[PDB]
Amino acid sequence: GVPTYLLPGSGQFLTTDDHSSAPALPCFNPTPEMHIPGQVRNMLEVVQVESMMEINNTESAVGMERLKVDISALTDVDQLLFNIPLDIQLDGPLRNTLVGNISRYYTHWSGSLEMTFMFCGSFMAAGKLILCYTPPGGSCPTTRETAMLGTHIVWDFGLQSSVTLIIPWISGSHYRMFNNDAKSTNANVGYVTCFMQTNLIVPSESSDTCSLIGFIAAKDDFSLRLMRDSPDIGQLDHLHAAEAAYQ
Amino acid sequence: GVPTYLLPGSGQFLTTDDHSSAPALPCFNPTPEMHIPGQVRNMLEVVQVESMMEINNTESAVGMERLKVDISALTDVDQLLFNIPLDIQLDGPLRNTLVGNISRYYTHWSGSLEMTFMFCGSFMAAGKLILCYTPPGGSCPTTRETAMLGTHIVWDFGLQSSVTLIIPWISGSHYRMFNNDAKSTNANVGYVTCFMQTNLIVPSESSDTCSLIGFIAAKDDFSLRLMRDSPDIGQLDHLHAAEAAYQ
Amino acid sequence: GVPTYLLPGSGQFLTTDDHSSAPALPCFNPTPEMHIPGQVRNMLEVVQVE
């Protein structure tokens, strides 16, 4: 017959292979493809949808208070409101996002980010903010004069109640790794900080504790590779009624 | 030679496979194909032939009394005569039919049904019936006013001694499953009921206990898939003289 | 290499099979076919003789 010989790698079940295998039910006629809305051909379509950041990931922020950021009328000048840990791959305010839960299925990532900060004060509430993106290397900037040297945007609470803070892709490498080292050059992303540009100025009948909802999406240049299992889920035992699937 | 490697699935005997295998008798000349009548290329040709329903599947209906339904002259108005459990896949009056014994080799089925009710009274016997098909969701309708809201046909015992009650294919899914749950949305079919439209009216020399024979077939749109073994047969021991095939 | 998988019926020696097999003596030159009388190509030629 045909003279063959088995290579190394014969009879090994590699889980991520791509091979035609023996059909159990022959001449099976599958159900015809009815047009269902919202098909996803590519997981980056899930990533590019903006989703809420949990910037208020503190104690005494129980449940839904973690999504919003309570900014107030400040009697001082140019104060810090919040800063955002930008590690998409690691734990932090970007972990429970569409850009973050899907990227923790991967190790290496590219592309820009897209923060939208939605202001949820009254219509009479007027003020301004500055949204500084600081590329990494140094400490998290605490005064406003330090951080406006980076990539900032100055945002009014006038007709504008939202923004698009494009976090630009600034990295030496093509991609960015995940490690347990958050301070690596290959892992660290930068720092988004937010300062009172002017103040939050409300009248006597508007609530002073106005809230910011922060979104994050991806851009069209976003990319993910080197797929890995999600650390966001994991079981130590079998689930309930998993025996009942056998019994 | 040719560098090969064994995939997972090598050396496993899958019963429903499709492979050319080694002929035991080489250069065998088979018997020439003589034209035998009634070739079946497809089991739906067996299904579309109408076959008797055992609507009278009661106690004290011994043997052949189960095929016929004894309707009588009723002194009341608009009474119920019989109702038919429409589960093709499950046990009931449709199990021992050509549409039912072949479909219990399968799990998922489609297409319309075709009930023919053959009246077997005298020629002097005149009357009318209504054959209501009730799509599922509710109870089996017991009064006539409840069930004529569905898909009914009103049938005379005049020149017509048979019908064609097309049970239409009404289902949300493309197919319909088999389970041990007869009340599932994917398993339940509906209810065919039969009422006195008027009455059975016979003279003094015709027998009042007139009988209906009910058929069921399939239509051209009928379909079956996901083949399984028949629950209608099964052995707990070897058959008689099965050792004699060895001895 | 070439992704293969063994079918049922692999490694079984069926006696009536038809397969090319490994020649023991390579570049063997057989004896040339001299015309011998009475060749039987088919056993029914043996049968039809009374």
């Binding site: 045909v2 003279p3 | 080489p26 | 038809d18 090319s20 020649p23």
Partner: peptide, 18 residues
């Protein structure tokens, strides 16, 4: 069957063509 990957002509399958 036309599979003969040997260099010898006698190594082929049984020539049952008649």
């Amino acid at each position: 069957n036309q599979i003969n990957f040997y260099k010898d002509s006698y190594a082929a399958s049984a020539s049952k063509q008649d």
